[PDB]
From a paper:
The tripartite ATP-independent periplasmic ([name]) transporters enable [name] and Haemophilus influenzae to acquire sialic acid, aiding their colonization of human hosts. This process depends on [name], a substrate-binding protein (SBP) that captures and delivers sialic acid to the transporter. Two of the nanobodies were found to strongly inhibit Neu5Ac binding and we used X-ray crystallography to determine the structure of [name] in complex with a nanobody that allosterically inhibits sialic acid binding to this SBP.
In contrast, VHHVcP #1 binds to a directly adjacent region (residues 1–50) that (as judged by the DDM) is almost perfectly rigid during the transition. Furthermore, we found that the thermal stabilization of [name]/VHHVcP #2 by sialic acid was partially recovered by the W73A mutation while the wild type cannot be stabilized by sialic acid when bound to VHHVcP #2. A quantitative binding analysis by ITC revealed a dissociation constant (KD) of 162 nM for the [name]/VHHVcP #1 complex and a KD of 13 nM for the [name]/VHHVcP #2 complex. While the [name]/VHHVcP #2 binding reaction had a relatively large enthalpic contribution (ΔH), the [name]/VHHVcP #1 binding reaction showed a much smaller ΔH and a correspondingly large term for ΔS, indicating a mostly entropy-driven reaction. We concluded that VHHVcP #1, 2 can independently bind to [name] at different epitopes. For the [name]+VHHVcP#1 structure, 97.04% of all residues were found in favored regions, 2.61% in allowed regions, and 0.36% are considered as outliers.
Residue numbers in the entry:
A (entry chain A): 1 to 299
B (entry chain H): 1 to 127
The structure:
């Protein structure tokens, strides 16, 4: 039998990790145990950049990574993680399957020995606030907590809010005291930190859509039998369907939980947001040398 | 599901030795990382030791390293926590835990309530 090593920053009990175990179960079934999967969670081998280098060298067999995260090595890939470029996951999936996506996935393989087998939906960031946000006009003046990360800052800046960097442990009390007016995160994070206790409103801003690519080392892929390749390919697709459905289900359950706890959930029109991000798309189109963003948005 | 059952426990003297056993019911034990937790009365749960299935790695909490030893017997589908040089600090309910496919044991402690299987613990009283 063969044992493949899979590493990830997520921890036990997470959806990424539960889907890795379902992949391990599925590989045991479809191979009669000829394939077994050993899981290294909690960034015990390093962060995604480190485990991606381990895939390049063949020291790690499989790992997760976002499509946009390739922008550190393949700069045009950052386009898909610019705010509001991806309208929903099926749009981000159509970008993954597009000529643009195939070209990135070709460059991943030929340069870095990363074979991307599939992409999975991993949730969407939404915005909570102490006052209702029914349109982009309400964002003016909003003290909005973002991580110190380029695109989350740009989302706050260009919607008209006042981006407020702050360490994650300090935010609950800052929302409680209204020192900060709101924050933006995935819905499971909002329940996890119990931000809903100190936030009366939740806007479905859908400003950032997240994916996980499932990447296997080409050095491992070349050593595998073509039967095993087919088993792995089919197992990843089967588990990705379930992973995407699990995330979509938990978001719907969390919105229903927030509505049951008295939270006002707003659904603003997002085309004003898309038009408000155009200065950031222009900065990207010009630095990348090709008008790419208008191209992904129209898919 | 997986059924885990502990053996061993009871009263022991300070400085004494005790061996805990944990037998697993199915045929997933050879592909499961195994661990030992403990909860002393009134305190939080502490991950004590763990042992891998794939790369043989072990974990110990600093409070027991150098005087607990963990080991595995796949032929009997059993893990052992061998408590040498026991201290009153060690008095607690001890719990056996299993997690399939996980390769690295220290990660069991991060979200213990999500782990695959648990035994209903065994009390160890040190005098």
């Amino acid at each position: 039998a063969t044992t493949l090593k899979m590493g990830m920053q997520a921890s036990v009990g997470s959806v990424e990790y539960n889907s890795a175990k379902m992949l391990a179960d599925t590989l045991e079934e479809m191979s009669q145990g000829e394939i077994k999967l050993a899981l290294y969670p909690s960034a015990q081998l390093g962060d995604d950049r480190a485990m991606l280098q381990q895939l390049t060298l063949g020291d790690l067999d499989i790992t997760y990574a976002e499509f946009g995260r390739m922008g550190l090595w393949i700069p045009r890939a950052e386009a898909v993680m610019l705010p509001y470029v991806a309208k929903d996951f099926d749009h981000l999936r159509r970008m993954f399957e597009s000529d643009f996506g195939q070209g990135v996935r070709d460059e991943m393989l030929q340069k870095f020995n990363w074979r991307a087998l599939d992409t999975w939906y991993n949730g969407t960031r939404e915005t909570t606030s102490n006052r209702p946000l029914n349109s982009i006009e309400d964002f003016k003046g909003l003290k909005l907590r973002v991580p110190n990360a380029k695109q989350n800052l740009n989302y706050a800046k260009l919607s008209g809010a006042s981006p407020t960097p702050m360490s994650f442990s300090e935010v609950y009390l800052a929302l409680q005291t209204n020192a900060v007016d709101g924050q933006e995160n995935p819905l499971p994070t909002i329940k996890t930190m119990k931000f809903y206790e100190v936030q009366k409103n939740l806007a479905m801003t859908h400003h950032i859509v997240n994916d996980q690519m499932v990447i296997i080392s080409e050095s491992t892929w070349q050593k595998l039998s073509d039967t095993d390749k087919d088993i792995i390919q089919k197992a990843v697709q089967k588990v990705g369907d379930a992973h995407t459905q699990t995330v979509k289900t938990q978001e719907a359950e969390l919105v229903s939980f927030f509505k049951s706890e008295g939270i006002n959930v707003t659904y603003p029109d997002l085309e004003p947001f898309r038009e408000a991000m155009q200065p950031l798309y222009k900065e990207f189109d010009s630095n990348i040398g090709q008008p790419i963003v208008s191209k992904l948005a129209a898919m | 599901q997986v059924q885990l059952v502990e053996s061993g426990g009871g009263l022991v003297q300070a400085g004494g030795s005790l061996r805990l056993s944990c037998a697993a019911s199915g045929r997933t034990f050879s592909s499961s990382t195994m661990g030992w937790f403990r909860q002393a009365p009134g305190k939080e749960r502490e991950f004590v030791a763990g042992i891998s299935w794939s790369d043989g790695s072990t974990y110990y909490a600093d409070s027991v390293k150098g005087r607990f030893t963990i080991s595995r017997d796949n032929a009997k589908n059993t893990v052992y926590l061998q408590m040498n040089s026991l201290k009153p600090e060690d008095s607690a309910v001890y719990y056996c835990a299993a997690e399939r496919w996980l390769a690295t044991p220290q990660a069991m402690a991060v979200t213990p309530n999500a782990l695959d299987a648990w035994g209903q613990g065994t009390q160890v009283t040190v005098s």
